[PDB]
Amino acid sequence: TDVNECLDPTTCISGNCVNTPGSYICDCPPDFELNPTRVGCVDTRSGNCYLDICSNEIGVGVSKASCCCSLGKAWGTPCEMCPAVNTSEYKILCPGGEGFRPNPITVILEDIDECQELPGLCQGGKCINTFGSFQCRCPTGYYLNEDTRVCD
Ligand SMILES: [Sm+3]
Ligand SMILES: [Sm+3]
Ligand SMILES: [Sm+3]
């Protein structure tokens, strides 16, 4: 008889498993698509990332997870609000919690590089990417405005 692999927790990352004879299928939620190896779901669309809500663009042409699993509050056009951190939506979009996103091809979790993807988080300063976060240093004479993310 068949193994019901859906009882395995590593099965169908960010997706809904449906057991079949042989292995199983992963049903991806709306806006998500199955990766090449069929072990999980990822949102592969591109869109702008916004700090407020759609305004205050901090990233251009980035994925929704890179935006929303970081400091973004809204993403894309038409504007989609990032899911709140305690919802099932956030669990699906950010399976590794804050600061990380699944590789669009291997679905392996990787650190989001905020300096490469969301430069607007440090307007006018020097950004250093870190594991799970990033650092922003404003040049001498300027200070980080926490609400706008602009050195001054
Ligand atoms: Sm099976
Ligand atoms: Sm829902
Ligand atoms: Sm990072």
Side-chain angles (χ1 to χ4, degrees), residues 88-106:
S88 59
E89 285 76 8
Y90 185 89
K91 175 64 149 179
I92 289 307
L93 186 64
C94 312
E98 186 164 61
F100 300 81
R101 64 126 214 209
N103 180 284
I105 292 176
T106 67

Side-chain angles (χ1 to χ4, degrees), residues 48-71:
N48 298 330
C49 183
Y50 305 92
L51 204 58
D52 297 313
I53 50 174
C54 245
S55 50
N56 211 164
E57 186 179 276
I58 48 169
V60 173
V62 298
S63 68
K64 190 176 183 167
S66 285
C67 176
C68 296
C69 304
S70 178
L71 301 189

Side-chain angles (χ1 to χ4, degrees), residues 84-151:
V85 303
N86 72 314
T87 61
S88 59
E89 285 76 8
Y90 185 89
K91 175 64 149 179
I92 289 307
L93 186 64
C94 312
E98 186 164 61
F100 300 81
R101 64 126 214 209
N103 180 284
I105 292 176
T106 67
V107 198
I108 290 173
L109 287 158
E110 290 170 342
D111 168 58
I112 292 162
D113 185 330
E114 287 90 344
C115 307
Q116 293 178 331
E117 303 209 83
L118 314 171
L121 291 178
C122 192
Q123 297 284 293
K126 180 200 169 199
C127 183
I128 303 167
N129 181 45
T130 66
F131 193 63
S133 186
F134 68 103
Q135 299 165 177
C136 173
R137 293 168 180 172
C138 292
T140 305
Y142 299 90
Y143 306 95
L144 224 222
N145 174 316
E146 301 292 345
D147 305 292
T148 68
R149 276 279 143 186
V150 181
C151 285

